[PDB]
Amino acid sequence: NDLTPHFEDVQAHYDLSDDFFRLFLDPTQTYSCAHFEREDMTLEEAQIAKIDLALGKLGLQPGMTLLDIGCGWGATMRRAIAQYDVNVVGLTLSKNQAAHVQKSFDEMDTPRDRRVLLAGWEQFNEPVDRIVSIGAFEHFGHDRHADFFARAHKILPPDGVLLLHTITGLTRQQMVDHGLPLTLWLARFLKFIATEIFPGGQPPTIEMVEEQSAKTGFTLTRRQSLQPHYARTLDLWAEALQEHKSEAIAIQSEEVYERYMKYLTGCAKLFRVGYIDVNQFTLAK
Ligand SMILES: Nc1ncnc2c1ncn2[C@@H]1O[C@H](CSCC[C@H](N)C(=O)O)[C@@H](O)[C@H]1O
Ligand SMILES: CCCCCCCCCCCCCCCC[N+](C)(C)C
């Protein structure tokens, strides 16, 4: 009981319009920090790289069941099937993403089991072999971190692994350590994000993830930062949207166009300056 998913807040963003998101996301519609392993790698190649990077840390074996909490448009799961031959289960609070993932699953010609549920992790209690979550944690809310890890720990096998990929904000002290000032623009931009882009969005700090996951019984076998990659990922998304300005205005409006350009370019500065980080936490039971 209780802890019912924050559908409205999350949907206010991801259910805007698939057509709109298609204007700037790479073809796989991955919506999270990419990983440019080769300097001249395209956004799609870098997104696939980030996918494989996360998946390869799980120790996936044929026949296992992989749970993707906050699966987005399903590229990660579809890639997990082809590259690791595992069955997949995806959770998302986005109606458009659920419909899209389902459709894409139907069009796949694989024997592996695959389904997507319009539900939060808080509503999922099925046993699974491994868990991947990329860019979803930031939406969970600090007040639910503890319960999140408890559930992940509960549904994973005794030697299960959780790959938690999430944006992390520097503590106030870390910012001071890095000589990053608390400017009016920063506070203003953050309020903007929370008000017009990601309501309910509360990125954790690094220590929050470590401490909370440790309390549950997870061991952090590795934390890997992709900070420099997000600024670039963000620039590419911003540029694509800008290249589709007229299409964006047609599908939505100039207001929405400008809102997203403001959000995309603004965040690119956050990572570029270093106010925000993005990390992959390999958590083992
Ligand atoms: N409590 C919750 N339970 C399950 N999914 C959640 C959630 N809060 C947010 N999400 C999901 O997390 C995703 C954030 S967007 C990231 C999508 C995908 N993992 C990718 O990397 O491209 C959305 O699919 C959103 O619906
Ligand atoms: C690309 C998004 C960058 C957000 C940077 C930090 C801004 C302030 C905190 C907002 C928290 C919400 C994060 C939602 C992340 C959603 N996506 C995974 C799809 C990018």
Closest by CA to 225, choosing from 160, 144, 171, 281, is 281
The continuous run of DSSP H or E covering 69 comes out as strand 65-69
Residues belonging to the active site: 267
Across the beta sheet with 130-134, the strand order is 114-118, 87-92, 65-69, 130-134, 161-169, 276-284, 219-225
Residue boundaries of the structural domains of the chain:
1-285
Site to probe by mutation for ligand 1, drawn from 51, 134, 139 as the one with most ligand atoms within 8 Å of Cβ, is 139
Q: Phi first, then psi: what are they for 143, rounded to 5°? A: -65, -10
CATH of domain 1-285: 3.40.50.150
Calculate how far, in angstroms, residue 78's C-alpha sits from the geometric centre of ligand 2: 23
For strands 161-169 and 276-284, give the pairing.
antiparallel
Distances (CA, A) of 48 to 56, 78, 121, 189: 12, 11, 24, 30
Regarding the beta carbon of 69 and ligand 1, being less than 6 Å apart is answered yes
Resolution for this experimental structure (Å): 2.2
| 204: its two tokens | 């954790």
Query: Strand 130-134 relative to strand 161-169: parallel, antiparallel, unpaired?
Result: parallel
Closest residue CA from atom 5 of ligand 1: 70
Round to whole Å and give the CA distance between 63 and 205. Answer: 35
Contacts of 184 (CB under 8 A, 6+ apart): none
Solving technique for this entry? X-ray
User: Can you give the C-alpha Rg of the chain in angstroms?
Assistant: 18
CA–CA distance, 63 with 72 (Å, rounded to integer): 23
Q: Which of 10, 21, 78 to mutate to test the pocket of ligand 1 (most atoms within 8 A of CB)?
A: 10
Report residue 44 CA to chain centroid gap: 16
Q: Which structure tokens are listed for 252?
A: 């939505």
For residue 5 the two structure tokens come to: 């998913």
- Indicate the SS3 state at residue 200: coil
